[PDB]
Amino acid sequence: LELCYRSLCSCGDRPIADGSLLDFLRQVSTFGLSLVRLDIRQESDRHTDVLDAITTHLDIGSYREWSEERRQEWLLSELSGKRPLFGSDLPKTEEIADVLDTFHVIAELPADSFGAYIISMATAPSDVLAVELLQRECR
Amino acid sequence: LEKMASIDVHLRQLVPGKVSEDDKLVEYDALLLDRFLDILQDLHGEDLRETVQELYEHSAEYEGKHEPKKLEELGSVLTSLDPGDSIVIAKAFSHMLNLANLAEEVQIAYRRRIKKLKKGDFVDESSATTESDLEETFKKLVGDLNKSPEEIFDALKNQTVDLVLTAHPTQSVRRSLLQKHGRIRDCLAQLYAKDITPDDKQELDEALQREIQAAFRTDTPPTPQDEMRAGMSYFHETIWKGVPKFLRRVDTALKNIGIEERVPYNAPLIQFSSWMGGDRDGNPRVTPEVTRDVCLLARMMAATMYFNQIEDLMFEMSMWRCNDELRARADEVHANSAKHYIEFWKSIPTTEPYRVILGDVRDKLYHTRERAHQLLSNGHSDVPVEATFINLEQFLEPLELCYRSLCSCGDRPIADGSLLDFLRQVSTFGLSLVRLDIRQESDRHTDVLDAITTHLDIGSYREWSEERRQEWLLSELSGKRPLFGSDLPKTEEIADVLDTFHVIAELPADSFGAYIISMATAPSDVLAVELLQRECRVKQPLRVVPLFEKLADLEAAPAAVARLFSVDWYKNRINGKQEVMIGYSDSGKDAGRLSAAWQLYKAQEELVKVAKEYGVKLTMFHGRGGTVGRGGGPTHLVILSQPPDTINGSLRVTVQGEVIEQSFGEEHLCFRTLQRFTAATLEHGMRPPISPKPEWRALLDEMAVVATEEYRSVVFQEPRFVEYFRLATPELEYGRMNIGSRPSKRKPSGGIESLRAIPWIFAWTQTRFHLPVWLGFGSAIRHVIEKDVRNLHMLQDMYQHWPFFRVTIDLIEMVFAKGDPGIAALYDKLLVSEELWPFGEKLRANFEETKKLILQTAGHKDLLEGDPYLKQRLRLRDSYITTLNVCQAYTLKRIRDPSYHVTLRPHISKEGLEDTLILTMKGIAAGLQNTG
Ligand SMILES: [Cl-]
């Protein structure tokens, strides 16, 4: 489309380009391939539950009992490391499996469909780092 | 056209006596040679035929008296040939030798056995003419060993013989030529039926000429899939039909000692494994895609054979009386959508329930084939996996239901017909016919784990001590965190290793056997493969099999295996079964043959001690070359020779590509092969060879020291040895030549240490010299005879009463039968510098002395004094091989030395010297078969 616009302006046909073509280009830029970008929203408590099942599974303690500073330090050590966090061998409750499966579905779809990951009942930086880490480790 | 009278005279002079009275070998080979030479005259002219026959006559005179004048008489003719005539002559002697092999096979398959020729001891087991068949072994176990028939039957129930097909070190013979050899053998045998009609005999003659010409008039280093296709041909040729016949013979022998059961049709007495498409050791051409390909190709061949076998099964299963269970399943199957038997029946009615169920099995087999084909040629399918058989139980279940129902209705005999054979074929061959072993050097696993730990900022696994490596590997196997992700710098090699693991992970477990670690030395190698397997998401990991090659590796093997059994993780992964591989050719390349033999006996002893300690069932995997690498009757005593309890009802042996045709090409040869493997395993489990006297072990330890000393002093210490090896032998041309499917040197720069075992044996086998096989025996026997006057008597006692020793000596004597120092001297004279010419003279003197000492030990005056049949057949081949030797020598001189101009002779007919060299290599290879 941009090629068509360039060519038409090249030939002194800019007014024609500013007709149906300009409207079309502006519609592609406004609406993209999806019209809308979907935000995902979930309570932070569910991320605490998922990371808690993860750390208990790794025999390191319960992320839930950890202070906010200890949570931040562990999350930061994992985001800066190269080793994956968990595998299929992971006891998932229905809720924990919902969270991870939502991440897998986001992972298998085009980025143009998604906007922001929204953390309900957010209070501390560890909530934001929890979503970033769960995002990265679900590929 | 009286040429036949002369070739008849020369054949009778070469093999004078009759090794029996059904000795028709001279007759057979005379017939094949007459028909071949007439065809040769017709295709390339009278002049070519006269030249060829002059060459063969001189060759037979040489194999008669070994006059060196005869060799120069051959050479004068062979050098004056322009490349065209050289190619036609070399091709001609190749097919002539092949015909001698085919005649030889007919002689072996139809030689009548002699009951009065048995002596009653273990020596009888060294020849097919006197070895024990299945039932003689039964009566040996019942009478002499006082074992009950119940004990024999239960042993058979739990026995497994696992035969492993490996790639040919040269020409893996194409399937078409296998078929042609089959037709030639059939025509020969039928021509000698003592009842044949005149017209049948004429038409048989016309078919024989026709087939010989068909084989003679057919001309990449075949892709691993093509070589695998060629290696699998023996299933169609004889093995598929041969297996149920043999198992049925086992049933008969059991009935004849009072056992009323048959061997359970699901008992895996026979299993087949393949390395074709799985061995990557020094072979970058064997890629992950190659392994996936041969896996799917194998599943395809299997589905085809089951599909074709199941229609005659459907015709036989026309009964109506049945089980309540079978009737229920038949009414169930009748509720569905009949495209693959419209030529037979419009649809299968419910009063033929076995036909209904079996028809549904045939339909699932068809969908199985088409899916495997679709995955092979594309990468995805659309054929639902639930519409096929994915594991052996989905397949066996309805067949077993049919069997149960038929026995329920008093139709057990019908069940023991086409149905029992079918069940036994499913149990033997599975959905793949073969299970693929994967082989890779340990060093590659060190490289992969090293890239992994460096990527995790923990250090280099390579610099870590063995104990630190073990501790880290064990901490990871017991942990729950994954090891690595896509974010991992992979070299081409490291990516190959991981991708191979991913391909294993995405294929059915029925296709795979064992993961084999080349150059294994320590438990960390085994744990490395187990961890890499698990972290690449292989749901059912393969059993890991370490390959201990060098002699020091053999000595350290029982400590490493005991340490492996002692760690809790490996102990729970193996579940009481362990397979260890030892390599005879490889170890011989390291330390000579005599030393590798005695070291492998002791090493198997110690591995058994460990296995009894930890309650693990050990399976010794015997690699290529060695005493365990022979053809026919000798193998029976070979198996009987293994140390007590090293087998224990689970045998795994490499069937070398150079013997596989002699062993499975013909119906009778195949049946007898399966028979002797099963019988020797069964007998050895209940009647081990004698334990060696203490002085025997001390004597072999000293001889082992002297023999490794001589071998390493010649092969590894002599500074000019490598130059001599590159001159007196076609090693350079073998590697450059695109012959061996893989390359020769592991690392291109290195010496013999890096040279693989197959080219090591091959290079010296081509020159009829065989130095890697016998070198070292000479000084060891000289040393013990000189150290004590009586040791010769001890040596002669061992050869007469210790099976391990008898088979080792027997192998050396047999290899000497295929040796001729005169031809080797011709190679020296043409290809080796004058500075280096006396060196071969010294080695040849060693050859002669070693030969005399082996004779002294065996109590023989001539070679193969105890096996005149083999002496006869080998002497027969030698007349053709000698001509390919002289041709190869002068062709080598012509290739290396363009300053050697020859007075050429005019072209002959047909109405590049590299090609001729390849011909001589393949020919001599086919005529000498197995050595070491
Ligand atoms: Cl090898």
Instruction: Judge contact between B676 and B131, C-beta under 8 A.
Output: yes
Q: Which residue carries 């490391």 as its tokens?
A: A81
| Tokens representing residue A9 in the block | 């302006």
What residues of chain B lie within 8 A of the CB of A83, using their CB? 456, 481-484
Backbone phi, then psi, for B242, in 5-degree steps?
-75, -35
Q: Does A91 touch chain B (CB under 8 A)?
A: no
What does DSSP say about strands A38-43 and B512-518: parallel, antiparallel, or unpaired?
Answer: unpaired
How far apart are alpha carbons B440 and B176 in whole angstroms? 32
What is the greatest pairwise CA distance in chain A? 71
> E strand or H helix at B101, and its extent?
helix B83-110
Backbone phi, then psi, for B545, in 5-degree steps?
-125, 110
How far apart are alpha carbons B294 and B228 in whole angstroms? 7
Q: Does B487 touch chain A (CB under 8 A)?
A: yes
Instruction: Judge contact between A127 and A93, C-beta under 8 A.
Output: no
Is residue A116 classed exposed, middle or buried when 0-12, 13-18 and 19+ CB atoms within 10 A define those classes?
exposed
Clarify whether B602 is annotated catalytic: no
Half-sphere exposure of B131 (CA within 13 A, CB side): 25
How far apart are alpha carbons B844 and B821 in whole angstroms? 6
Q: What angle do CA B15, B20, B24 make, to 5 degrees?
A: 60
Q: What is the dihedral of CA B558, B560, B566, B567, to 10 degrees?
A: -160
Would you give the DSSP letter of residue B81? B
Distance from CA of A57 to the nearest CA of B (A): 7
Q: Which residue carries 């779809």 as its tokens?
A: A109
Question: Are B480 and A85 an interchain contact pair (Cβ–Cβ within 8 Å)?
Answer: no
Say how many residues make up chain B.
932
Bridge partners for B419 per DSSP:
none
Ligand 1: centre distance to CA B772 (Å): 14
How far apart are alpha carbons B602 and B91 in whole angstroms? 46
Q: What angle do CA B566, B571, B577 make, to 5 degrees?
A: 115
- The sign of the torsion formed by the CA atoms of B71, B74, B80, B86 equals negative
In chain B, which residue's Cα lies nearest the Cα of A90?
B480
How far apart are alpha carbons B779 and B707 in whole angstroms? 6
| Tokens representing residue B337 in the block | 């959508």
Backbone phi, then psi, for A120, in 5-degree steps?
-75, 150
Query: Cα B156 vs. chain centroid, distance in angstroms?
Result: 24
Q: Which of B286, B290, B284, B222 is nearest to B739 (CA)?
A: B222
Instruction: Judge contact between A22 and A1, C-beta under 8 A.
Output: no
How far apart are alpha carbons B372 and B378 in whole angstroms? 10
- Other C-beta atoms lying within 10 Å of the C-beta of residue A109: 11
How far apart are alpha carbons B616 and B594 in whole angstroms? 30
DSSP code per residue over B638-677: HHHHSPTTSSTTEEEEEE-TTTHHHHHSSHHHHHHHHHHH
How far apart are alpha carbons B314 and B406 in whole angstroms? 14
Q: Which of B404, B395, B393 is nearest to B324 (CA)?
A: B404
SS3 B219: coil
How far apart are alpha carbons B795 and B810 in whole angstroms? 13
Q: Which of B270, B231, B228 is nearest to B247 (CA)?
A: B270
The alpha-helical segments, DSSP class H, found in B769-832 are 771-774, 777-787, 791-801, 803-817, 821-831
Instruction: Judge contact between B92 and B37, C-beta under 8 A.
Output: no
- Other C-beta atoms lying within 10 Å of the C-beta of residue A105: 11
How far apart are alpha carbons B439 and B423 in whole angstroms? 31
Q: Does B457 touch chain A (CB under 8 A)?
A: yes
SS3 B418: helix
The active-site residue out of B589, B622, B684, B818 is B589
Q: Which of B619, B638, B468 is nearest to B546 (CA)?
A: B619
Half-sphere exposure of B12 (CA within 13 A, CB side): 7
Clarify whether B609 is annotated catalytic: no
Instruction: Judge contact between B587 and B550, C-beta under 8 A.
Output: yes
Mutate: best of A54, A58, A77, A83, partner B, most B CBs <10 A: A83
SS3 A118: strand
How far apart are alpha carbons B127 and B132 in whole angstroms? 9
Q: What Cα–Cα distance (Å) separates residue B622 from each residue in B512, B600, B618, B651?
A: 18, 10, 13, 9
How far apart are alpha carbons B7 and B25 in whole angstroms? 14
Half-sphere exposure of B228 (CA within 13 A, CB side): 28
Ligand 1: centre distance to CA B758 (Å): 5
Bridge partners for B440 per DSSP:
B517
How far apart are alpha carbons B172 and B153 in whole angstroms? 38
Mutate: best of A74, A80, A82, partner B, most B CBs <10 A: A82
DSSP code per residue over B501-515: HHHHHTS-GGGEEEE
Instruction: Judge contact between B111 and B22, C-beta under 8 A.
Output: yes
Pick from B455, B456, B480: CB nearest A89: B480
Instruction: Judge contact between B654 and B623, C-beta under 8 A.
Output: yes
Q: Which of B188, B187, B181, B293 is nearest to B238 (CA)?
A: B181
Residues with Cβ within 8 Å of residue B429, at least 6 apart in sequence:
B235, B240, B243, B272, B302, B305
Backbone phi, then psi, for B569, in 5-degree steps?
-60, -50
Ligand 1: centre distance to CA B756 (Å): 6
Q: What Cα–Cα distance (Å) separates residue A58 from each residue in A54, A77, B19, B247, B481?
A: 6, 15, 75, 53, 7
Residues with Cβ within 8 Å of residue B831, at least 6 apart in sequence:
B727, B728, B889, B892, B893, B896
- The sign of the torsion formed by the CA atoms of B548, B551, B552, B558 equals positive
Instruction: Judge contact between B677 and B648, C-beta under 8 A.
Output: no
Bridge partners for B655 per DSSP:
B165
What does DSSP say about strands B160-165 and B650-655: parallel, antiparallel, or unpaired?
Answer: parallel
Q: Which residue carries 């086409």 as its tokens?
A: B418
DSSP code per residue over B470-492: HHHHHHHHT--S----S-----H
How far apart are alpha carbons B309 and B429 in whole angstroms? 13
B386-409: buried (b, 16+ CB within 10 Å) or exposed (e) per residue? eebbeebeebbebbbbbbebbeeb
Query: Cα B742 vs. chain centroid, distance in angstroms?
Result: 17
Q: Treating both helix axes as pointing N-terminal to C-terminal, what angle do A94-107 and A125-137 enclose, rounded to 10 degrees? A: 60
**Rg of chain A (C-alpha set):** 22
How far apart are alpha carbons A104 and B844 in whole angstroms? 73
Say how many residues make up chain A.
139
Strands (E), chain A: 38-43, 114-120
Ligand 1: centre distance to CA B420 (Å): 39
Query: Cα B49 vs. chain centroid, distance in angstroms?
Result: 36
Backbone phi, then psi, for B621, in 5-degree steps?
-95, 115
Instruction: Judge contact between B303 and B235, C-beta under 8 A.
Output: no
Size of interface A-B (CB pairs under 8 A): 28
Residues with Cβ within 8 Å of residue B776, at least 6 apart in sequence:
B592, B593, B594, B595, B706, B707, B708, B710, B711
Which residue type occupies A103?
Answer: F
Distance from CA of A8 to the nearest CA of B (A): 45
Instruction: Judge contact between B448 and B497, C-beta under 8 A.
Output: yes
Pick from B455, B482, B487: CB nearest A87: B482
The alpha-helical segments, DSSP class H, found in B115-223 are 134-143, 149-158, 175-191, 198-216
How far apart are alpha carbons B440 and B118 in whole angstroms? 46
How far apart are alpha carbons B119 and B330 in whole angstroms? 58
Q: Treating both helix axes as pointing N-terminal to C-terminal, what angle do B551-566 and B593-614 enclose, rounded to 10 degrees? A: 10
SS3 B468: helix
Q: What angle do CA B521, B275, B526 make, to 5 degrees?
A: 25
Q: Which of B650, B624, B623, B653 is nearest to B636 (CA)?
A: B653
Residues with Cβ within 8 Å of residue A78, at least 6 apart in sequence:
A85, A133
- The sign of the torsion formed by the CA atoms of B926, B927, B930, B932 equals negative
